[PDB]
Amino acid sequence: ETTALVCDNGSGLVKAGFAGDDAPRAVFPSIVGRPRHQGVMVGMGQKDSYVGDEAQSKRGILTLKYPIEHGIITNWDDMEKIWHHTFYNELRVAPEEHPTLLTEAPLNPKANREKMTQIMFETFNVPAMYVAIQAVLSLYASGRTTGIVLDSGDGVTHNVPIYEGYALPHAIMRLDLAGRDLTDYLMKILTERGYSFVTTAEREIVRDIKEKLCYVALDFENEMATAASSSSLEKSYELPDGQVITIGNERFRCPETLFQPSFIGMESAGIHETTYNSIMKCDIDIRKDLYANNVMSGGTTMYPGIADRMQKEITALAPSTMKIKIIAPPERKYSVWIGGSILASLSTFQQMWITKQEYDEAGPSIVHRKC
Amino acid sequence: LKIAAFNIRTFGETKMSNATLASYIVRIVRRYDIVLIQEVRDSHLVAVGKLLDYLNQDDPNTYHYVVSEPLGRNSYKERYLFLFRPNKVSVLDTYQYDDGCESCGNDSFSREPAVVKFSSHSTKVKEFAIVALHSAPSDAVAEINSLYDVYLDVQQKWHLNDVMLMGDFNADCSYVTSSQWSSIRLRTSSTFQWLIPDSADTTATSTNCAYDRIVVAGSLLQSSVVPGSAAPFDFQAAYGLSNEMALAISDHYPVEVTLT
């Protein structure tokens, strides 16, 4: 009857639902739009602002704001809007009626963690809340409490090592690169071949190419050779106007950027290296567990055959005879949500929440302790 | 007070990106205090958004707008777009023709007509409505006939008799023959004056067709009409264009009327 809430908010997508489902109730873009010009839709009165999915669908008569940058909240007054819409329009619930578990970026400035709390208790008057680190929850989703997680969503990619359920701050790795970037390059390179990707609908077509045609090459060279000799690992994709087009090596050049930031001119190590760098920056004793416990989560971790490359990469950098194991659960698109729902539903966790009284008598700081 | 209806072939991002083509659209739009633009193929409102940018880049409120979600029975979709000058007219209420239910709009209308209660202090008519239609060519007879039901509805909801009805009705040549005029209550009824005649050429192509129309009911709105101000707007001549250029703006001329 009186059910808990789970809300995983990302750079691009919000994942909102109830504690105990498998199963976000709502997935919608994390954007706030405001009318650039004065007017109305038919049957409808003036709109002050568009949130989430009507924001994107009416983009062209709006100025958009993306409140979450690289994983962290940077505009607070737009984010309230995003939560309000999440509560009342998307879920259709009353906030004061529901305990709410929120998720959070790795290496979240302490200051932010406090705002989230004050707003939930104050703007939304929630009875109970808790903040959990995203990677830490997607790790729970898999059924461990120790391991290494590679978060790769829309704007950021993280390497987060976990022991005992403790995220290990000092050793996290952060590549300022993700899907949005990957999409960009795939646009740039398709426009290179002699294609037009100007329209909003076109710049959104490219995004589905990524999600349908792209795999990672286990060996990049062979793969470049395979496409240049046999000339038939090309697939095709039907654009809106009847027009279909052929896609070739472009398919796997795109994802490869992750291992070679050098494709967009970034003096950052690729993801196989940053994952290694992460491990050999932890306590020596627990590293065994870490090799045999690589868990994959995030939108950009869905490429058919990414895990395999990771599987056959670190082998090279790992000690010669190490047990490398890589877990990428099929539902890992929403692995982070799934873990939050788990956490907030289990009758044992019921204590770890923050009370109403507890925020009032303590302060906004209660969250550094109990979370 | 000039009123116009303008079918702009495949009006979208591609058209608005092109600056020659955009200056002319703006040149034509600026002619009017109320213009209906049809054949809006703009999935995210970027073309619409681009145009208002041009019309409001100086004074912020040169124009305000009314726009529909994309309509069509099947997957090919388009929107109706109304631009008006807020300082001469205002909008009291708008709605979409629903045939009396949720999913009934498409029971007679491929593109469910949009209805607008304009308020005009400058003219003899103080409040009047405009009904917008761009019919399905293969079903023009029925659709236009169906505008009569839409007029009855406008009387029922708004208790208003003074109604302009207009759009690309496809009301000529192949699509509506002489014998078929008798099947259209909108034409055989004494309630409506048809301002654009049958001999009019509302197409930018080499066809001679009276497709785009303007229809008025109700004494006050009829009396407001400046005689001989209903007419097609031949922009090719008006702007001294080549055919190819005129053609790449649209294959229809706006229909206009002036009210006093």
């Binding site: 691009g12 997508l13 639902g17 109830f18 105990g20 489902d21 498998d22 199963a23 976000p24 109730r25 709502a26 997935v27 919608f28 873009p29 989430g52 999915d53 994107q56 669908s57 729970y140 059924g143 461990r144 409490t145 005992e164 359920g165 403790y166 609908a201 959104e204 077509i205 490219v206 995004r207 589905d208 939108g299 799934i338 729902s341 788990i342 956490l343 539903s345 289990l346 044992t348 966790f349 204590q351 770890m352 302790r369 109990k370 | 999935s43 995210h44």
Partner: peptide
């Protein structure tokens, strides 16, 4: 960890969530 080891075990041993459909709106128009 505030009531942790226990909670740590509940996660490893597992939990069975139930079915809710989803209108995931991350298809690119």
């Amino acid at each position: 960890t505030p009531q942790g080891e226990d909670m740590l075990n509940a996660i490893r041993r597992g939990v069975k969530l139930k079915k809710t459909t989803t209108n995931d709106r991350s298809a690119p128009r």
